[PDB]
Design a protein around this ligand. Sequence first.
Ligand code: NA
Length: 128
Amino acid sequence: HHHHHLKMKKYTKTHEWVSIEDKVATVGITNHAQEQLGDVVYVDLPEVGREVKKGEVVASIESVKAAADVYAPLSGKIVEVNEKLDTEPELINKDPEGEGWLFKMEISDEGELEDLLDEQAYQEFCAQ
Ligand code: NA
């Protein structure tokens, strides 16, 4: 038997998602979020190497009619950004929870994951 990886998807009430693989969290905005924003025209992504705390503003998204800040769902360090979004920010509309992911981070405190919503709780939250 081999050491089990940690794999979960979590959500925030600010309509962000976090896909976790051991210590690496991939973060983006949910389908619900992109629906509210409309056609995305511009993304500002975080800088790789940046140390962030849960709640800090790490990205900005601008659409035709609106704008939203993206908050760090967890504490840790930015390790990768989705550079293709600088040229193709509409991938956020096309596939917000897949291809349109924003950044990946190495997390510092796994206990923070227990503060986020699971998929059932999030789907309920959106429905309500
Ligand atoms: Na879960």
